[model samples]
Target: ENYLSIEKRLYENLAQESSHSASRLQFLLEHAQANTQGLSDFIGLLADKDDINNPEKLKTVLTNRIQRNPDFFGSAIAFKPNTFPNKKLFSPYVYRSGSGFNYLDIGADGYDYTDGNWDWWSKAINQVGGYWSKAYFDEGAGNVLMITYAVPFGVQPDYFGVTTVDLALDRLPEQLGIAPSRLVVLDDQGRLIFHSDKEKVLAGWLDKQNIKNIAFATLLNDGQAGQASFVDDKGTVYLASVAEVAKLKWRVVVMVPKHELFASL
Candidate 1:
């Protein structure tokens, strides 16, 4: 029957990968048939010479053949370049949505840029994927915390650095209700310039890991801002907002306890 044929091929591939006897494959085939329809189809596909001999190549070819595949690795994710019309100006939070990534300066109440083009954003996303989803700032309500999805790394003519800086400078203050500070800037060594009472503790912890810069290290170490808990000198619990300024090796951190920051929101 079709079910038997599918089972035979499924076991065969398992045998090839496991270096096990076909009997063991047969056992798996027999034992795992409760939800066999999908598996059956998969097994049927595997019986083809092209699928069996070159699964990886077949996957690649099929992935490419699917036109405008939304789930394609590149199409599924995106990035927006950082830009600063003025070096002194800061950028805003860039959001990734169903349409694409929107870089906006909420403080200015306007869009800084909207990038839907797949190729450029895909490359940028790939380069910074590991550190994506780092925290940027949290609104007073704590209900919404802005985050940096990517931070560009490298030297000049490499625009990756620009995105982080531009995003932070433009948008952070709007969320915080204050002017951005130098303490938010990252030194060439990637250390934070200003230390919140709790940041000092994080700095010490990072030091042990031999993390020289706070900007890049924060993403690798803390994961995201507002997600990590911090205790201040006053024994007050606070949430830290962390973001990576890729170009400058700076990770901007802002802290506020729930009692103080989130009272209104």
Candidate 2:
């Protein structure tokens, strides 16, 4: 009877942990979204005033914005071809380089940003929720795992460009790694986003020997909260509680080893 009661309490703790982790994740992401919108608005204002083509002003704004938001890995503006007064390809990208930032013209290398291949450009211009880009590994930009929030600027007939802010996954574990029990954060597609163990951060959940469980997968994919358990190859059992960061369609799973749960009793 006492063991059962202890197990019940353990689940309760896991549930609370899941909720807390989700809320924190939501807060950070919403903050990034807000920053993206703010920059987009500013760029639109520049376009309305016919000052959008000023390269110096654009660089200054990108620099200022990234400095203001330390969580933002970088900020950039990609102008549509022929949109600027002088340059045909004018996309300025500002990214952190160690203690400071480096500002460079993204299009200077001849990469066509308006070619409908970059999600930060094409998708954001088309869909309503397109502002939030899917997480991807940017091979061109130092091979960092990150997501970009992109908002389009200017009116439809004269669509100017997109304002973007990137959130790098490297620093995210520090913010989301609070754990007495193992905390696993998965992206909308169930790819690992942040885990207590850095090595497993970007790996698929099923690829982990200790994490494959049909019941838990169902609950996580369905965005439902439930209790599930799985045993590892070494015969250690774990109790899992799952929760969703609803707006983002991400999952936060709290796992407590069976022995650890009863150890408190």
- Which candidate comes out best when scored by TM-score? 2
Query: For candidate 1, lDDT tens digit of each residue in 1-265?
Result: 6755644444343223222222232232222222222222343334343343333443343334222232111111111342333222222333333365433343244322233321222334335322322332323111133223233333344432212211222333433233332124333454443333334422542333332334434553553322233453345654444444333334445444545544533
- Structural similarity to truth (TM-score) of each candidate: 0.24, 0.81
1-265 per-residue lDDT for model 2 (tens digits): 6777878888888888778777877888888888777777766764544566666887888888888887889877887777655678788878887878877777775367777667787887644333766566655652577778888776656556788888887766555655623777777777776655444564443423344566766776676767787665556788888778867888877887888877765
User: Model 1: C-alpha RMSD to truth?
Assistant: 22.2
- Give every collision pair in model 2: none
List the candidate 1 regions with Cα displacement exceeding 4 Å.
1-184, 188-190, 195-226
Q: Rate the local accuracy (lDDT) of all candidates.
A: 0.32, 0.72
Scored by lDDT, model 1 comes in at: 0.32
